[PDB]
Write a protein that binds this ligand. Structure first.
Ligand SMILES: CC(=O)N[C@@H]1[C@@H](O)[C@H](O[C@@H]2O[C@H](CO)[C@@H](O[C@@H]3O[C@H](CO)[C@@H](O[C@@H]4O[C@H](CO)[C@@H](O[C@@H]5O[C@H](CO)[C@@H](O[C@@H]6O[C@H](CO)[C@@H](O)[C@H](O)[C@H]6NC(C)=O)[C@H](O)[C@H]5NC(C)=O)[C@H](O)[C@H]4NC(C)=O)[C@H](O)[C@H]3NC(C)=O)[C@H](O)[C@H]2NC(C)=O)[C@@H](CO)O[C@H]1O
Length: 391
């Protein structure tokens, strides 16, 4: 194939208002190599629909089909259905993976659920397995998924269902839940969630996803970087080419205790203000940060972490822009990784009119440029935030 651009689509972006309202049709069919639908759900231990909107029933197409319709314009595109995520909790996953009967019950529900809806594979987003029991059962679930997927592919003579998983970057989390060598052997590839290294759960300011940890940081702290985390999965037994490194189209926000101290690892009095469209304190969509910059926000590039943050009053945002991204893509190329994962496709300037470069998908578009050599076309150019906004 080459390098992968795996984009996560979220079915709750449909509920956003004005510039943030996102429908599947807002995805260019050749933007990504894989689209992962977030999320499916679990019910009675079986793969089920999150809510009716995703399913098509009344002769009105649901979100599943509206997504998978993208494969008509681009046959080479692959779609997966992801189950889990944060809001899903762990308890249901523990119970599903507990016994072989519990697992197989899930597995044999999943395969027809996926085929009947024209999905090409399955993404397991259990956050996270924890303890020695989960560590074993997590592996068992992946193994038995792989086995069955394989068997089915041969019986029905179709290309095999893909099996993937989103996995964490917190060293603690990893050690405690993931038999990495085996976990990787059964997955087709690995979505490394190289983000949420820092957030409103901390009394300090920190970047959502630095490539390298600052000098300001503590040595134990220094472990928190996209570079350390990724190399840590290779060290534990993961194949380089199965690692798809996560890239955030969102930023984690803070409120400065004192707006005069706006440097990274400054004291913060809690999370930053909610975005107007995302409506959740502690983060903003990249297009929501563009608005801040284009309305008096100051921009700062941290040449240590190779990522930027922005400030407006006592509001502090760590994010990724085209400069931050590209540098990362080169990093991927350099370390020979599988490609890029993107959380999310719906929080990039998908419309083209917000950040101001008049280019749809400036970020993921730049990932596809660097990794797969496909121009954003025309004369589109990175917005040069430095000059554009105050310091
Ligand atoms: C005690 C202490 O100090 N502990 C520290 C420890 O916490 C630190 O470690 C860090 O911890 C934090 C939280 O404790 C971790 O944060 C979680 O990180 C995971 C990834 O590992 C995130 O999950 C994936 O990433 C995306 C991005 O967040 C997730 O997207 C979220 O998904 C949820 C639901 O799935 C969305 O909820 C939706 O909210 C909207 C808005 O209101 C609502 O309308 C929707 O209805 C609702 N969803 C539904 C289904 O209804 C949420 O919006 C979205 N976030 C977005 C879009 O920005 C997604 O779940 C995961 N992706 C895939 C793929 O599965 C998780 O979100 C995140 N949680 C929180 C609360 O932040 C962090 O990962 C962890 N990092 C590290 C490095 O450890 C450590 C380090 O400082 O120190 C300890 O001391």
């Amino acid at each position: 194939d080459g390098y992968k651009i795996v984009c996560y689509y979220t079915n709750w972006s449909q509920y956003r208002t004005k510039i943030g309202k996102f429908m599947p049709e807002d995805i260019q069919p050749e933007l990504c190599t894989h689209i992962i639908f977030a999320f499916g759900w679990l019910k009675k231990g079986k793969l089920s629909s999150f809510e009716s909107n995703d399913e098509t029933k009344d002769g009105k197409t649901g979100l599943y089909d509206r997504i998978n319709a993208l494969k008509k314009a681009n046959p080479k595109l692959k779609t997966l259905l992801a189950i889990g995520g944060w809001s899903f909790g762990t308890q249901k996953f523990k119970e599903m993976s507990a016994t072989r009967y519990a697992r197989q019950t899930f597995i044999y529900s999943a395969i027809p659920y996926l085929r009947d809806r024209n999905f090409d594979g399955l993404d397991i987003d259990w956050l996270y397995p924890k303890g020695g029991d989960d560590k074993k059962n997590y592996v068992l679930l992946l193994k038995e998924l792989r086995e069955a997927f394989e068997a089915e592919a041969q019986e029905v003579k179709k290309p095999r269902l893909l099996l993937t998983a989103a996995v964490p970057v917190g060293p603690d989390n990893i050690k405690s839940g993931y038999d990495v060598p085996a976990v990787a052997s059964y997955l087709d590839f690995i979505n490394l969630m190289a983000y949420d290294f820092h957030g409103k759960w901390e009394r300090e300011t920190g970047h959502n996803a630095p490539l390298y940890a600052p000098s300001s940081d503590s040595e134990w702290r220094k472990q928190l970087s996209v570079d350390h985390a990724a190399h840590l999965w290779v060290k534990l037994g993961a194949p380089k080419e199965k690692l798809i490194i996560g890239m955030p189209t969102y930023g984690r926000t803070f409120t400065l205790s004192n707006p005069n101290n706006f440097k990274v690892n400054s004291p913060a009095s809690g999370g930053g203000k909610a975005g107007e469209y995302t409506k959740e304190s502690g983060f903003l969509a990249y297009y929501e940060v563009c608005e801040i910059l284009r309305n008096g926000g100051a921009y700062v590039w941290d040449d240590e972490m190779k990522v930027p943050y922005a400030i407006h009053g006592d509001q502090w945002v760590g994010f990724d822009d085209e400069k931050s991204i590209r540098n990362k893509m080169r990093w991927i190329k350099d370390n020979s990784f599988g490609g890029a994962m993107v959380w999310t496709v719906d929080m990039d300037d998908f419309s083209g009119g917000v950040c101001g470069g008049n280019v749809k998908y400036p970020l993921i578009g730049a990932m596809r440029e660097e990794l797969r050599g496909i121009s954003r076309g025309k004369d589109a150019k990175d917005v040069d935030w430095a000059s554009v906004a105050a310091s």
